[PDB]
Amino acid sequence: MAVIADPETAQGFRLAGLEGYGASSAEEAQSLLETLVERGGYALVAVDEALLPDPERAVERLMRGRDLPVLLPIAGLKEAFQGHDVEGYMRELVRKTIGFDIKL
Amino acid sequence: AKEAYAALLLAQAFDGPEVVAGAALGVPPLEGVEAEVENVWGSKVPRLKATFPDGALLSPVGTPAYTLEASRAFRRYAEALIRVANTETRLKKIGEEIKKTTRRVNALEQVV
Amino acid sequence: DDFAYLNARVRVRRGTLLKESFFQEALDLSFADFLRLLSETVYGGELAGQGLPDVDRAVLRTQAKLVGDLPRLVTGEAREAVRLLLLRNDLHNLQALLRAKATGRPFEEVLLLPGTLREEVWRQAYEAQDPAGMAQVLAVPGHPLARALRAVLRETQDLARVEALLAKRFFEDVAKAAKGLDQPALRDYLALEVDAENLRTAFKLQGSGLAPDAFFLKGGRFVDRVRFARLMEGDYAVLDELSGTPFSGLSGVRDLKALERGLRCVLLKEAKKGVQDPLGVGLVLAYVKEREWEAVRLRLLARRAYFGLPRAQVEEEVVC
């Protein structure tokens, strides 16, 4: 289980035990994500919200192998002290699903 | 997340950064977490469960007092994270199957 | 040797301290106002640029420049007494160093936060044939850590239980040196610190249900072994039984965060009585503890200004 979320606050995730990496540059984080989907880091990668909205497209390009490395947008900490916009996140997830701006 | 981030900031705050740095580089990597079967619609989607070496504290006579409470908070964080993970991938699979069925209906009707 | 020659520099250092209104003004900033207020502070001389790790390194260097000299320039029994003030950082450094030696990681992998010994000795102690040889490499004349390692070294070579017994014997040797010193204030301060650490360990071992007699230590004055067993069990009435002692407000609190907050408040209140002896060494330890509390509060204010914590989120951190 690996994360790419923060420069220093990923040490709390390491303090949970679960491994990770932080770079605060998008392309070295994505390159360690690339060696993390080659050497599969135990099936979970949690990626920062306000650094990568969609982490999955480049990863399914550079690996059409199956979705055992699961990719989540995990929340940035600073924006976590604002408000999650749970509603708008589910709006963009449903519009990523079927395109429609239909609201459940 | 608000609980765990506030506890982590306050724990690296009242103590030093170096104590939690060496502590976090001391913790075992919590490995063997893997993904097993949810075969449904004839489609195995991987749900995730961990292994959690948690109660075996690293020599549980521990001198910092806010590392362990923060570590319990981040284990609760990992709990909620894997719950959101194995719900989110199932929602994605059912959405793409709706897209498959819909393009199959429209193709089959408006062609054959 | 001279308990007043160091106390003169201690009073000069205590004259250069931030007020409570400096922390009250830090409740409303944007970390640039906090950076400007830190530039006017005495700690700002080590301030290189902007950023949270730069401010943390500047605070650490300022603490080492303002408190680290008091471990030096002392002689004899005064040096041996003042050695038992900045002992927790060196103990944590030695504990994580023994953990790394039992782990096998790189010697440059450790952080090695500043203590009271030479860093070249800690570098040479990374590779050692025996733990007694590592203790002899790290052997100072009056440091109790070397004698504690020599005492607890007759169990095994390197174990995690050996490290736990080393920490317990380090606290016990601090209590024994406090009993063996001619200082009416620092002995009671260290005894209250040991009792609060035992109560914190009883809180941190709640739910384990194991044998607390191995977990408990000796040296306290406000707690009992039956009281330690009642604190190991889920009995907050024993925490209500601490009447008349320094744990006055500490009663019926089940939250470990609030328990450690009340313990730190009681410790700061006990160290605030250290200004009673203006000729001994307790005023210097009081100034050291006040600078440590101010530095922890400055690190908390820096984390709050970095990640945008509310003033209500830090209102439980500025009570004392």
Swiss-Prot record, chain A:
Keyword rRNA processing applies: no
The entry's keywords: ATP synthesis, Hydrogen ion transport, Ion transport, Transport
SUPFAM superfamilies recorded: AtpF-like (SSF159468)
GO biological process: proton motive force-driven plasma membrane ATP synthesis
Gene3D superfamilies associated with the record: 6.10.140.810, ATPase, V1 complex, subunit F (3.40.50.10580)
One Pfam assignment: ATP-synt_F
Role: Produces ATP from ADP in the presence of a proton gradient across the membrane.
Protein name: V-type ATP synthase subunit F
From Swiss-Prot, chain B:
Provenance organism: Thermus thermophilus (strain ATCC 27634 / DSM 579 / HB8)
Domain of life, source organism: Bacteria
Its biological purpose: Produces ATP from ADP in the presence of a proton gradient across the membrane.
GO molecular function: ATP binding; proton-transporting ATP synthase activity, rotational mechanism; proton-transporting ATPase activity, rotational mechanism
GO biological process: proton motive force-driven plasma membrane ATP synthesis
Similarity section: Belongs to the V-ATPase D subunit family.
UniProt-recorded name of the protein: V-type ATP synthase subunit D
Keyword terms: ATP synthesis, Hydrogen ion transport, Ion transport, Transport
Curated annotation (Swiss-Prot), chain C:
GO molecular function: ATP binding; proton-transporting ATP synthase activity, rotational mechanism; proton-transporting ATPase activity, rotational mechanism
Keywords per UniProt: ATP synthesis, Hydrogen ion transport, Ion transport, Transport
A biological process term (GO) from this entry: proton motive force-driven plasma membrane ATP synthesis
A GO CC term assigned to this protein in UniProt: proton-transporting V-type ATPase, V0 domain
Family: Belongs to the V-ATPase V0D/AC39 subunit family.
Name of the protein in its database record: V-type ATP synthase subunit C
InterPro entries cross-referenced by the UniProt entry: ATPase_csu/dsu_sf, ATPase_V0-cplx_csu, ATPase_V0-cplx_csu/dsu, V-ATPase_V0D/AC39_subunit, V-type_ATPase_csu/dsu, V-type_ATPase_csu/dsu_dom_3
Highest classification ranks of the organism: Bacteria, Thermotogati, Deinococcota, Deinococci, Thermales
Source organism: Thermus thermophilus (strain ATCC 27634 / DSM 579 / HB8)
Record Pfam families: vATP-synt_AC39
Keyword Transport: yes
Disulfide bridge positions per record: none
Function: Produces ATP from ADP in the presence of a proton gradient across the membrane.
Record-linked Gene3D superfamilies: ATP synthase (C/AC39) subunit, domain 3, V-type ATP synthase subunit C domain
